Subunit: 496 residues, 4 copies
């Protein structure tokens, strides 16, 4: 754990930052063709941070063209895997050298607490880039068992220009989850970050040039959803799009592919993740520690967040007590105060969506056992709502904020049925002392990860992604992320 600075010292670092403002295309910064900009404001203070280039289909066309040329060049693609690894490791170094700068910049643009930006987001981003850089020259393709008269290989090739559309809850980490495997594979990429959180991706693109990523191989095009993301998804020279965000918006990229060049689309979408607590747990306070973390890490702005606590009727009350006590340890406020584990939500509009589910809870006359408060029109208290039946809108809809629903069950067959009563299937957690119960819960819950007696998303080597409406066509992290950005080729050589 790197040492945390003081509030004043972070403010001092903020004050000296030269925030990026222009798109990054073909090796350097440039304004949008139409010269428009949009406001990036610190959600916790209201202060304007920068006037960021507001790109449209014209800018996207230029960015894709510079990526297409670089791909056809071979300037990046033709380096050896060991060489591509070296350059991406250089990039990760530079991020590490600039860690405090990037951590403060991430916090300012997003509302995320500096404490977690420094200890989690930045180290996780640096480690994602290192892991995928190191992986590329460890990947073996195959030869097929075809006999002595032929030599058949089954190998992988970079798909081409790759569009990467990002959300705002983990700007840098999501950036690394995508560019890591995509760049290591030898693709050129065009990154359209969230307009709420565009600054750090722009800075990382500049650092990548310094590291020797050639011009045109890693471009960042900031702008709105319809204005910049749709032309990217529709572009006839983009070979593949990887998207993370809402299901509603991910569906559009399936249309964009269908109506353009049949580009491969991979979606990582939302979830309504359950946390199942059996009555045979060995340590209830440790469970409560994991449930609180799962529900409220990053203010609940987390695709893997625990949002449905599904708890055995005999331990519900004892668990709720220990959850309330754990919550006393979760300070919320000024994202640059290192004492805070909770910062501001990303934007007035997102704050309004979360707070609307506070209202919905009260409309449904549900018991708000903990939390329920708002501050400064941008902070929501960690909230726990008891007595939530599967028919509640709080049970069924992704809130993406610090709001935990609680549902009781009487036997494990009901817990599993409840856990699967969703159109989503991203993640799940299960808590039990029993081998029998643990095998049931981890095998029968239909989710892309099931953690047992802990909360989390795995590590750099385990794939992450959704069943059902939580994802489409792939997985982030692990060696399987490489599949997103490559085509399989059978080379069959007669030898008869």
């Amino acid at each position: 754990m790197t040492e945390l600075l003081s509030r004043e010292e972070y403010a001092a670092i903020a004050a000296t930052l030269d925030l990026p403002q222009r798109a990054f295309i073909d090796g350097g910064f440039r304004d949008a063709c139409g010269g428009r900009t949009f406001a990036s404001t610190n959600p916790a203070t209201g202060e304007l941070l920068a006037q960021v280039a507001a790109c449209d289909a014209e800018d996207v066309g230029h960015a894709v063209a510079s990526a297409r040329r670089a791909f056809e060049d071979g300037r990046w693609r033709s380096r050896t895997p060991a060489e591509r690894k070296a350059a991406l490791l250089r990039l990760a170094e530079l991020l590490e050298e600039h860690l405090l700068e990037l951590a403060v910049m991430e916090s300012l643009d997003s509302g995320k607490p500096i404490r977690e930006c420094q200890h989690t987001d930045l180290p996780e981003t640096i480690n994602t880039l290192r892991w995928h850089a190191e992986l590329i020259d460890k990947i073996y393709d195959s030869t097929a068992p075809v006999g002595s008269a032929a030599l058949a290989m089954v190998v992988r090739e970079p798909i081409g220009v790759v569009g990467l559309v990002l959300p705002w809850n983990f700007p840098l980490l999501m950036l690394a989850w995508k560019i890591g495997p995509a760049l290591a594979a030898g693709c050129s990429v065009v990154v359209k970050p969230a307009p709420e959180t565009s600054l750090t991706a722009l800075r990382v693109a500049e650092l990548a040039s310094q590291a020797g990523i050639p011009a045109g191989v890693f471009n960042v095009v900031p702008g709105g959803g319809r204005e910049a993301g749709e032309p990217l998804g529709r572009h006839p020279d983009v070979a593949m799009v990887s998207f993370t965000g809402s299901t509603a918006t991910g569906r559009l990229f399936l249309k964009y592919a269908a109506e353009s060049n049949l580009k491969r689309v991979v979606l990582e979408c939302g979830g309504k993740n359950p946390a199942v607590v059996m009555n045979d747990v060995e340590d209830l306070d440790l469970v409560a520690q994991h449930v609180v973390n799962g529900a409220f890490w990053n203010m609940g702005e987390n695709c893997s967040a625990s949002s449905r606590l599904i708890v055995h009727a005999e331990v519900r009350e004892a668990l709720l007590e220990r959850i309330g006590a754990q919550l006393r340890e979760w300070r919320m406020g000024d994202p640059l105060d290192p004492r805070n584990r909770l910062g501001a939500l990303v934007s007035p509009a997102h704050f309004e969506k979360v707070r609307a589910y506070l209202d919905q809870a009260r409309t449904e006359r549900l018991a708000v056992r903990f939390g329920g408060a708002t501050e400064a029109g941008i902070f929501v208290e960690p909230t726990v709502v008891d007595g939530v039946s599967p028919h509640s809108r709080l049970f069924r809809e992704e809130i993406f904020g610090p709001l935990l629903s609680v549902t009781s069950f009487d036997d494990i067959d009901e817990a599993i049925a409840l856990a699967n009563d969703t159109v989503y299937g991203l993640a799940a957690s299960a808590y039990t002392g029993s081998l029998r119960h643990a095998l049931r819960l981890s095998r029968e819950i239909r989710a892309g990860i099931v953690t047992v007696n802990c909360f989390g998303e795995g590590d750099a080597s385990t794939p992450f992604g959704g069943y059902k409406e939580s994802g489409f066509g792939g997985r982030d992290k692990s060696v399987w992320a490489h599949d997103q950005y490559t085509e399989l080729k059978t080379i069959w050589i007669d030898a008869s």
Copy 2:
């Protein structure tokens, strides 16, 4: 190599067949709810074969419901891999016992010649099922390198109810390419075959019941594209659709996914496959033999068909000469006549499309060097059209008939640029005596298979599928077909 019968003998098998007519749903035959039928006719004669149930959204809803109930109660997927292998092997045994019956039925409904139905289609169908049956209890999933405090498995689970939408050109073989891996993975499957070629799929689904595939696990819903295919793609309980057919239609299934439950979609589509012949080949007669087979096997009704001959100027004429000689061994006519390697095209509508390209050749004043004639409104001669420039419509568009365009090059860089001059990328073949040239053609042609010094699609162990607009998201055959029908799950077990 099984022994061919006489024309009269095949006619006698045909006269005794009890052709299936009804949807196969939940372990038995049934009529469409609305009582509608459509006329399946022998494309070589115009004679009615059967009035086949014309299923609609309601029948699709019943078929999916039975597939869903079978999936949920585990009657198939809870059997061990070894048990699922045994039942699939029973099925392939049954197809083998009914080989002649199935070959004649396949010919009658499709126009495909009995000779190839008996020696290629049925044995390849039987083998596809055996290989994928045999594969399932040889597949290992993973555990991830996460250290001593946790145990992390990365496993595959069956995705659920699977929709399988098939084309008319290889009815039985495409069926096996889909149900082989999908049933072996433990999915329930609802098959919507082409209306031109529905009889054999129905017969197989009946034999699968006999072999112990439980009720609801393998259903066949015959009917039209909009009437039965669309409701299947839109169905909220179908988890995945695998499609083989035109790019135009495959685009629709991406929209159906976007507009319903975000089901996984895998598309296998058309191609415009090149055949590159260098001036350093060791046996021009053998090249001619492979190029003729690649262009005119199955009357060019073949996704992998050689349709663009891209030949070095020094060998163009001497190749064409041996091609003509080879074409003298390719007899066309009555599909039940064992002497014919070429039968009838699938329908008057398709014959029209193919003939309009013969007219287009004349419109473009191109040299028709071989063939060019039609017979009886349903046969087309193997045709070779010389001097086709990349701007020609015959160079750019999928004809799906026995029509080979010929284009010259001077150097291998031009050959490669010509081979990739297409929105497609399904297959490619390349002939050369040079190690240097072989590696260069193998690596630089953007296709899912490149055969060197032969024509083909690989074997059971090699993946088949398109780059670019020839495919989306997957590969048929090989162990990679398994990925289409399964979800990855990380099971992360704390052990701290």
Copy 3:
């Protein structure tokens, strides 16, 4: 489960058997060069069964020469994996057609009960051959991530002539465990079975010729250890030896390799396998069912047999009670009486070794809680000895008979220490209701398999083999058995 016949009917099948008697070399039977024979007698009756060729280094030389020629030929090796699979599947069919004959013959030569020979040994043998036949055309080798200037494959090739030295406790199953992977890989093999149990291997070799295994590819050379096994291990043209038997004898094959041609040696040796029962098991009677089976299946003549019951002090007595009750279900006698789960030990000499540990228990004044009796100088009762400390010779030495030692423990750290207090490391079983305890026991016991809440050896797809002195250099079953019989080759093709 195939239907069991009556005692009289098995006797009738025995009476009509034409027992093999000669070595099987280069496609057919032949006497030993020196014309000597040795007696094969039914251990349960004393009756002579056959005078079997008593081969020496001369016969071994001929067998290896016929295998060397076949390997150099390519007659087997050069068939495609799919073709080798077909022939080995034919062989498995023939065994199935002759199942009752082989089951009776196995029982007569070995003492093993006909009930288990019919229901277990023969089906397991047939399934081993089928699994490895099916596997061969599912195995992919690799290509290395070396960049664009070279094409590097990493492939596997058959090592050559392979010597297979077998024990007597599972003659057919061990035969299949070895020839399966070795033949599927394309090696020629020379099999030296145990002199106690040579008949069924000879019969299987004849059936393999009928199935189309070419002459010289699968030879069987019966004879003594020093007389026939040592020349095989020393032969300068044998490329690899796979051995199963005692550690003492396995050590010799390391010397034989060192003193001859450095052939690869793989050893599968004995064990002193623990069975750990925690005090938190959910069903004690079901544990007792698994412990009794583990200790006494095949009369304890089992490398994976449970021989050290390591049981928590609070459940020892309750477990011993349920073990005694389970034992009432285990009838021992006349191996052709289908009512018997226990048959005769393999030979007077082995009977004397087992009975010597009965004496040793009484010498050490240990409590013999169950069993302790002998019959007919060839049957030992299932025996349970209580109060066995780690210093006892019964704790430390492989008995290979129906004798279970019992040791108490007070906490799981002592159970694990006890479990690992051995020079062996073949197998282990652990029984617990706790996830925490199950993870500890399965990760910290140093054995090649740990089964949890059941007893066994895995299945056809899981590797089997020993840590420490229980094995050397490989694993039987699973895809990893293939490694035993192949060499890795890197083919590096410049392409610069």
Copy 4:
């Protein structure tokens, strides 16, 4: 490519080195218990470098004991793969910072020329460690297809205390080839280096402590073959030995295993590697360039060295001519002189063996076409001996010096038979323009690597190791090196 210094500058680094002298055991330096030493001298001058501790069975016992205690308490192996990777990367960083120091030290002790020590040995050593560090958290184990009633994992565990016995020809590189994979797998390692070349291993073990390799995990015990190597191979707590050296000595470690605890033994031994040159190569000068490098890199003190040139009669003379021309670029002399590609042989004893083969050439009245002279009792010229028949001693025996035999062939079947005319099978190279010939030479030469149209040993990702008497049981480099130091375990968890 790092910048070479002047002869005087290297001499000045040499004059300042504080050479290690003591065994490295349990995290620090210590004397041998008996107080003995042996004289390590510069083979180019005769000057004493250091009196090095001369360890015996007692010191080996202490080193193993510290390695055992470290293994049992998990100080290294209980760290995560990612943590073990980080410390190994620290180590490789340290070697990089001391590159010049280590290169000069390597030259002094071995006679290897400083130029190759600086540009090949050290960078390859540094890279070996990085690759194997980077690999460990990319390795996935397996789960087996056993059905729904059980969960079966097939995992790898570290084998325990590992003995690593090294030769003198590539001291640092062989060290990395062994400790890279073995430390990454979590083993403790006891290294017994060659007495000629012990200094650099000692230095590295000290740097490994600095890098956070815990005490006892990486020990170095210098001393003689019988005195230190034998007790290591016989030690009852060493689980595995990996050996690289002569076949004669490697045979002894198989006996040591047999006569102690049945520890796993992996042997990498000598070779007699062929270089096959077809008459259809496109650039005879480039072939000559690869054949010269293959024969005379590291003065022919190279297990992969080209020692049998097997050349088509039509190109023999024109090849030899360009070989002579190439040899004019290979300067021999003072190992600290950066101009020299060839330094001193390792010892007067080895110089004697090499010279006796020069005398043997003259005895056999063979045409010495190039070289043939010696200087100063320790240098040997690059020598090419023409007209060597397969019956010659120079054709059959490992010389391990800069001596190339030349043999002609008329057809490729004879070339292949000549290449395989040996008890060895470590490496081979093959030059041809023909695709047909390349596949034929690639597949039919029985060696662990066949390079086509180049000379080499592959790269970090490809396995290196011998067929036949060149190896036993394993491969160095690549992911397969991991198998040497790990045990497979099936964890079968009932879930019925």
